[PDB]
């Protein structure tokens, strides 16, 4: 047949600054959590109602109420308060910061894409370094290149004075730059197609020519693999440097709040100055918020606790022997809670309760009509008990405990008809009689059940355990007479007897010839075996069988035979 096709996909990607803004609009600009006096969310704070929505459904910041678009006085949208679980905000960083995932997690992605060692690239972010000629798509006129650990002497006084400060700032961040912003300019100016060709030719040169050549080859394959994925996707490599910082919705942060406060505090400080030392403080704080435990000693609060980042965030029964195999017993106190919705419906359906409110009071007050309804709705409704989890048909029992059959706390009630069908037709304790491991039976009798069968079928004593001296029993017409004699204490459970047998010879026994054959001269002969006697003739076609057994063996045979016959008659 034709498959019922179902095409669903989910993808993750790095997010542009534009998408970050589109999520929020929404800018959090103040490090305030909650006002001390009014105990209200601070305006433009981490819990602001401009940015994340009302804390009360339909109630605005000023207190105006409307039935469930923006208030004229405050601007709160008159919607459900649940929007605070899903509404994002964002922080506008004065200086771009690298994403710690793509810089510090070895192997570094930014370092591999730029073909610069992480050491010479980490100092550009956390040390007092500067990178010359960050870009290559615009005119430049200085012969500087690479990373400068110190500062250029002429670049401090002579060059800014010669071109004037106002005219110098225009082309300043084109000859030599610093911070994570310099990295973003390198990423944005990368020619990804040049990377592939340069990596391929360098890779082939090393092939023509021991622990470094192999390692450098793996570096080149990773770099050209990385460039190819950027080309065929809509992910820009410059998004690895964050310009905006998305802010988690307040309801998911009722640690993270303090980390947000630190980022806002330093970012607000940096924009007041407008320095490089302050940029490091902003960049380091964002690293702590995104993924701590990547720089060495992580940030710790005053109570000697290491701050958790987002990377840390993402990373009685009583036996009942009379029960059937497919049934279980539930107490009234447990059953009425599990089935309350059905008891309420049954009361309304049969007009014993006018509505839902009245139906609750009768359950509350233990009105006896409740228990009649509870028995009705429970019938035919299986529950799941947690082959650790199975499905049983519950029955109401006296007492306060859950009663389980001897071959077996969470109780689940399937609600939908689809779930009720699965429970009855797939999870019941009689279509799962074989284990999947090798196909063995699961519910074999054990312990006291097994001892009872063993004693029942341990037959008569034999030989020197039956007779004190070397010998140099009742006959029963049918098995019911033998069992009846046992009930009247005429024989014991293991006393030997002869049973007239009117079926075929189906007695499991040692494959042995007769111990003795008694052959009468008129033609009849008796064949005496270890467990049965067969009477035959050379004149007639007679064949009479008598089995030497006990009522215990008869009882075991009858129980299985009557079980099979009883089930057949009932079905």
């Amino acid at each position: 047949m034709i498959d019922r096709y179902k095409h669903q996909q989910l993808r993750i990607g790095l997010v542009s600054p534009q998408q970050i803004s589109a999520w929020a609009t929404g800018e959090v600009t103040k490090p305030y959590t909650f006002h001390y006096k009014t105990n209200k969310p601070e305006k433009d704070g981490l819990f602001c109602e401009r940015i994340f929505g009302p804390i009360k459904s339909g109630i605005c910041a000023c207190g105006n109420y409307r039935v469930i678009k923006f208030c004229e006085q405050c601007g709160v949208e008159f919607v459900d308060s649940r929007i605070r679980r899903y509404q994002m905000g964002y922080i506008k960083l004065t200086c771009p910061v690298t994403h710690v995932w793509y810089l510090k997690r070895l192997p570094s992605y930014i370092a591999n894409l730029l073909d610069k060692p992480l050491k010479e690239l980490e100092g550009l972010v956390y040390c007092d370094f500067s990178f010359a000629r960050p870009i290559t798509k615009k005119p430049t006129f200085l012969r500087l290149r690479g990373s400068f650990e110190y500062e250029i002497q002429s670049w401090k006084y002579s060059i800014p004075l010669f071109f004037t400060t106002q005219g110098f700032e225009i082309f300043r961040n084109r000859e030599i730059s610093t911070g994570a912003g310099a990295i973003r300019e390198q990423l944005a100016d990368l020619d990804l197609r040049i990377i592939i060709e340069n990596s391929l030719v360098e890779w082939k040169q090393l092939g023509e020519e021991d622990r470094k050549i192999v390692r450098r080859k793996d570096f080149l394959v990773r770099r050209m693999e990385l460039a190819k994925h950027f080309i065929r996707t809509n992910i820009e490599p410059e998004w690895m440097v964050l310009c905006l910082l998305p802010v988690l919705p307040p309801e998911l942060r009722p640690d993270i709040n303090e980390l947000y406060r630190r980022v806002i505090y330093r970012n607000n400080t940096l924009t007041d100055l407008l320095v490089m030392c302050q940029e490091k403080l902003v960049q380091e704080a964002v690293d702590t918020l995104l993924d701590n435990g990547i720089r060495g000693q992580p940030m710790r609060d005053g109570h000697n606790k290491v701050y958790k980042s987002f990377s840390d965030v993402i990373e009685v029964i009583v036996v009942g022997p009379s029960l059937s195999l497919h049934r279980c017993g539930l107490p009234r106190e447990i059953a009425i809670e599990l089935f309350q919705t059905f008891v309420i419906r049954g009361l309304i359906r049969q007009h014993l309760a006018s509505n839902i409110g009245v139906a609750k009071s009768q359950i509350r007050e233990k009105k006896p009509i409740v228990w009649e309804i509870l028995q009705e709705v429970m019938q035919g409704h299986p529950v799941l008990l947690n082959l650790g989890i199975q499905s049983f048909q519950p029955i109401l029992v006296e007492g306060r405990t859950i009663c389980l059959h001897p071959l077996v706390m969470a109780v689940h009630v399937p609600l939908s008809l689809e779930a009720q069908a699965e429970a009855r037709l797939l999870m019941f304790s009689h279509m799962n009689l074989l284990s999947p491991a090798i196909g063995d039976p699961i519910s074999v009798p054990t312990q006291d059940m097994l001892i009872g069968l063993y004693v029942l079928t341990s037959g008569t004593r034999r030989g020197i355990c039956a007779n004190r001296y070397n010998p140099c029993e009742p006959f029963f017409c049918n098995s019911y007479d033998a069992i009846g004699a046992y009930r009247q204490k005429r024989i014991n459970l293991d006393s030997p007897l002869w049973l007239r047998w009117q079926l075929d010879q189906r007695v499991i026994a040692s494959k042995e010839v007769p111990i003795e054959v008694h052959y009468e001269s008129f033609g009849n002969y008796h064949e005496i075996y270890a467990h049965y006697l067969i009477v035959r003739s050379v004149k007639k076609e007679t064949l009479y069988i008598y089995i030497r057994t006990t009522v215990g063996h008869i009882s075991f045979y009858r129980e299985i035979e009557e079980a099979i016959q009883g089930f057949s008659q009932a079905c």
Binding site: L434, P436, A437, I438
Partner: protein, 37 residues
């Protein structure tokens, strides 16, 4: 390696017939080895 067919798996142990379409036999194999640990 992302799925198996009825004939390559064979008979079901719990049901006696050839294994049915839609059976999560990977999870069953995982339990059948982990549980006797």
């Amino acid at each position: 390696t992302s799925w198996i067919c009825r004939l390559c798996y064979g008979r079901s142990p719990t049901h006696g017939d050839l294994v049915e379409l839609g059976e999560a036999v990977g999870i069953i194999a995982g339990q059948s080895i982990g549980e006797p640990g």
